[PDB]
Amino acid sequence: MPVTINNFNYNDPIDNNNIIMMEPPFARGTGRYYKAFKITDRIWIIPERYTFGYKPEDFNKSSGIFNRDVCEYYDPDYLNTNDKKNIFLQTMIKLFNRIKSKPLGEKLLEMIINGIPYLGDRRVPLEEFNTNIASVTVNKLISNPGEVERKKGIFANLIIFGPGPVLNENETIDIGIQNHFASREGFGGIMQMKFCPEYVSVFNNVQENKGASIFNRRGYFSDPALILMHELIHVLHGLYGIKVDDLPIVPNEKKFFMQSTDAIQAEELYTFGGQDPSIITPSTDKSIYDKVLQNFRGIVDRLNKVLVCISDPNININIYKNKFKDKYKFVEDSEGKYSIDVESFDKLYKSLMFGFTETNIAENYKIKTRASYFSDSLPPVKIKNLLDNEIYTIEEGFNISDKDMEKEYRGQNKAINKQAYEEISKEHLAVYKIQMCVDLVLQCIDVDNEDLFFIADKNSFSDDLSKNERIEYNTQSNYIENDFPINELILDTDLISKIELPSENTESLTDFNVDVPVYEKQPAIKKIFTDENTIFQYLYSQTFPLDIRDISLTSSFDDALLFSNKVYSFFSMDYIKTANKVVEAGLFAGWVKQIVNDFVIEANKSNTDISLIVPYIGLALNVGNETAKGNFENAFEIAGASILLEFIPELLIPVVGAFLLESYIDNKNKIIKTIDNALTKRNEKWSDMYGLIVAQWLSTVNTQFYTIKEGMYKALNYQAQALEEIIKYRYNIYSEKEKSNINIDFNDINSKLNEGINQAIDNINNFINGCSVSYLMKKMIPLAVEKLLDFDNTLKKNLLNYIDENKLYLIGSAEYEKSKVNKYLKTIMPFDLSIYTNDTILIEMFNKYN
Numbered sequence: 001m002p003v004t005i006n007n008f009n010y011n012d013p014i015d016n017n018n019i020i021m022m023e024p025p026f027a028r029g030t031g032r033y034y035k036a037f038k039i040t041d042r043i044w045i046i047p048e049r050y051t052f053g054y055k056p057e058d059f060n061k062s063s064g065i066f067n068r069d070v071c072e073y074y075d076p077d078y079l080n081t082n083d084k085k086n087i088f089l090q091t092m093i094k095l096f097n098r099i100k101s102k103p104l105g106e107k108l109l110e111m112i113i114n115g116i117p118y119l120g121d122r123r124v125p126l127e128e129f130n131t132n133i134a135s136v137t138v139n140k141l142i143s144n145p146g147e148v149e150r151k152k153g154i155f156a157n158l159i160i161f162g163p164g165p166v167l168n169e170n171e172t173i174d175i176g177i178q179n180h181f182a183s184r185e186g187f188g189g190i191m192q193m194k195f196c197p198e199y200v201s202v203f204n205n206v207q208e209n210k211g212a213s214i215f216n217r218r219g220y221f222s223d224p225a226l227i228l229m230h231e232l233i234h235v236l237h238g239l240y241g242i243k244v245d246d247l248p249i250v251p252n253e254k255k256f257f258m259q260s261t262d263a264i265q266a267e268e269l270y271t272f273g274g275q276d277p278s279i280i281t282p283s284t285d286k287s288i289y290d291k292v293l294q295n296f297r298g299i300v301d302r303l304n305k306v307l308v309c310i311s312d313p314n315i316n317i318n319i320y321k322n323k324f325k326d327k328y329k330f331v332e333d334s335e336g337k338y339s340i341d342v343e344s345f346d347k348l349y350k351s352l353m354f355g356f357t358e359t360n361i362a363e364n365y366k367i368k369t370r371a372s373y374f375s376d377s378l379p380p381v382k383i384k385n386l387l388d389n390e391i392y393t394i395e396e397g398f399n400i401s402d403k404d405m406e407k408e409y410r411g412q413n414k415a416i417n418k419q420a421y422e423e424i425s426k427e428h429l430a431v432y433k434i435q436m437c438v439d440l441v442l443q444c445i446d447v448d449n450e451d452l453f454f455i456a457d458k459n460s461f462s463d464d465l466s467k468n469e470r471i472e473y474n475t476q477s478n479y480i481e482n483d484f485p486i487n488e489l490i491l492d493t494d495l496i497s498k499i500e501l502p503s504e505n506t507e508s509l510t511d512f513n514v515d516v517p518v519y520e521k522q523p524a525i526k527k528i529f530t531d532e533n534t535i536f537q538y539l540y541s542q543t544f545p546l547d548i549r550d551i552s553l554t555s556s557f558d559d560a561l562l563f564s565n566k567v568y569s570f571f572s573m574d575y576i577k578t579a580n581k582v583v584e585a586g587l588f589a590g591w592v593k594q595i596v597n598d599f600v601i602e603a604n605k606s607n608t609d610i611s612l613i614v615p616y617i618g619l620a621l622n623v624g625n626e627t628a629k630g631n632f633e634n635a636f637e638i639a640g641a642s643i644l645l646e647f648i649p650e651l652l653i654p655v656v657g658a659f660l661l662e663s664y665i666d667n668k669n670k671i672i673k674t675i676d677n678a679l680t681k682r683n684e685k686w687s688d689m690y691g692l693i694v695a696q697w698l699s700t701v702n703t704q705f706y707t708i709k710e711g712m713y714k715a716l717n718y719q720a721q722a723l724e725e726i727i728k729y730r731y732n733i734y735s736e737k738e739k740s741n742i743n744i745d746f747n748d749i750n751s752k753l754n755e756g757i758n759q760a761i762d763n764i765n766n767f768i769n770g771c772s773v774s775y776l777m778k779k780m781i782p783l784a785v786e787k788l789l790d791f792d793n794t795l796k797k798n799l800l801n802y803i804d805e806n807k808l809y810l811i812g813s814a815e816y817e818k819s820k821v822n823k824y825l826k827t828i829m830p831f832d833l834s835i836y837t838n839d840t841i842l843i844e845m846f847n848k849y850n
């Protein structure tokens with residue numbers, strides 16, 4: 001059935017149906033009940049702060065943070081009134097209506113609703129259903145006149161709370177019992193969510209096209225409906241019990257400049273989609289696939305052995321057998337035995353993991369989102385009113401075509417849609433900072449954790465390529481594509497639920513055994529000591545305090561750090577001396593016209609062995625290999641992409657494990673199949689190796705080059721802010737008569753300097769992407785290929801010897817198979833970057849390379 005969204009006010013009475021007093025999983029049967037509203041079937045909204053595992057003091061902003069990743073905003077007063085709770089409800093209703101306004105989101109919701117948790121746990125015997133567990137059953141309190149008195153159990157799929165202490169930290173939580181999680185083991189379980197629709201993340205698009213302003217790179221706020229949908233994909237993964245853990249991406253923390261973060265799971269990167277799944281190696285891709293498939297084999301074994309329900313005799317065995325068949329897409333034969341169809345499972349697995357994706361959804365709803373999970377995140381903002389249809393609609397969100405806001409996501413642009421958001425007071429924002437001290441005169445700088453380089457540790461990547469391989473007659477090789485055509489997902493019928501939803505009513509919960517997570521704050525500051533002045537210092541030397549009036553530019557970095565009226569500039573000597581020039585009022589307009597024009601010329605500097613090089617990057621940042629000293633062009637011309645890297649990573653290139661070939665005496669066909677299966681497995685290992693190199697490149701090198709791009713945007717903005725301050729000061733120095741006659745437009749100066757910046761960032765983008773790809777193609781790929789050419793020779797020797805040891809059992813085609821092995825192992829698999837990315841910008845850089 002088509003997805004129905006319910007309507008209700010917070011003040012509406014308890015009907016024991018769509019509005020109930022509920023005992024949530026982490027309440028632990030302690031007599032605490034919450035007013036819960038059924039927004040859709042199996043999904044409940046509770047307009048209350050998420051308190052479980054926290055302390056009351058946590059809801060206030062202190063000197064600590066919960067997550068090093070996040071710019072955390074605190075507000076204890078959020079949701080402290082009945083009216084505030086009603087707003088929350090109405091906004092959630094509105095967001096859910098926006099989700100189902102397009103088919104794709106409707107599919108996501110219908111799959112959540114119908115993806116009921118398996119009536120069991122790992123502790124539950126294979127022959128039984130059990131609804132007496134916290135991941136399946138939730139309790140409601142009935143309050144009527146003197147006739148019936150008790151608790152009553154209902155089935156639920158998703159319970160949505162208000163935020164925890166951190167308003168903008170939306171999280172989806174799964175239920176753990178006895179150190180294990182049902183939502184990671186094929187069963188599935190009641191998913192919980194803490195959510196706040198009003199405080200949204202901010203991102204930027206620093207890697208784009210167009211040299212004109214058109215308000216490029218000015219900042220973009222996120223669409224609350226997309227954020228919710230990101231969490232709904234987690235909910236989906238959890239209800240299908242496929243939200244598994246494998247080898248995570250763990251940040252390297254052995255250097256001061258390296259970013260600090262918790263481990264990043266593949267489930268998180270699959271959810272985001274886009275370029276990110278390529279950061280999860282093909283070995284780990286298969287590992288996750290196998291664990292999911294094995295879990296599904298457990299459930300299919302359970303359904304074939306299930307006969308009774310222990311908790312409730314009112315539970316109809318056939319109804320739930322028919323529903324779990326419909327949920328997991330099993331096939332039933334003649335006798336009634338359920339089994340797994342691989343073609344069904346793969347379609348299901350790929351739709352849940354690679355179909356429903358933040359990138360796929362955003363690109364279908366015409367909503368701008370960040371480029372990667374590894375994109376820098378700016379300070380969050382408050383959306384004034386989401387219920388205001390002149391600002392935010394169900395159909396089009398922020399990008400409303402009547403307001404001329406649809407074109408290029410203008411409705412999300414911070415510089416255009418000023419009236420949609422309010423900036424947040426930094427007194428309420430907690431940010432994980434690194435206090436950096438350089439060697440009376442000791443200089444300290446508070447540096448955001450977000451502005452540090454993300455570099456994946458060596459232990460992030462799998463070594464499964466080094467393991468041996470048993471090649472038998474039925475050995476099947478796999479490629480799991482980190483892609484799924486979105487139009488096929490929208491039009492697919494097999495994923496739509498066939499069997500009707502069972503009634504939510506059941507027996508009350510008596511077993512309250514649950515693992516509740518515990519959260520504590522850590523200090524938000526860390527002091528480091530170092531000898532090197534790098535980017536953080538060089539960027540800071542381009543800033544000035546707000547009280548300083550007569551600032552002047554300097555090409556001396558030391559003088560800029562020491563003098564607070566001195567600001568470091570990386571442009572030419574002529575630009576600096578022109579900017580520090582004091583003229584009579586009559587020639588001022590000419591000077592403003594000259595210096596602004598000079599800024600644009602200086603920023604657009606790019607002389608022309610591939611693509612174009614921007615020469616001031618070294619002076620601007622001093623990134624990597626002391627690039628501010630000497631001449632950057634010369635230093636690049638010798639070494640190349642390397643000099644810009646702050647850290648040269650240790651590459652993981654495993655020696656490919658030997659193939660062990662099975663013998664089949666008096667069976668010709670099984671000998672021929674084995675030789676064939678070994679050659680197809682060779683292609684798999686080549687593809688996997690390429691995937692391992694790309695995985696490391698994206699998370700260890702390409703991220704460093706992204707930080708340089710973000711550094712250059714800041715550096716160029718600092719130079720514009722310095723020039724604007726100088727012009728403004730020089731303007732105000734004149735008399736009131738003088739100011740009147742020779743006037744300039746401050747909006748004109750802003751837009752012109754901004755347009756030069758976008759043109760410059762374009763040049764830097766082109767150059768840096770060139771560096772990144774160049775590094776992959778020169779310093780990474782060849783080394784992998786070299787070990788694959790060793791593996792080929794080893795396999796050549798192995799297969800040829802195998803043919804000899806079996807020459808009599810073939811006879812008719814021994815020389816045929818020998819020439820088959822010879823020619824197939826001369827075909828080297830071509831490396832194609834289009835398999836891993838869809839950026840087009842990086843695709844062309846790869847194509848230009850010979």
Ligand SMILES: [Zn+2]
Pocket residue numbers: 230231234268271
């Ligand atoms: Zn997530």
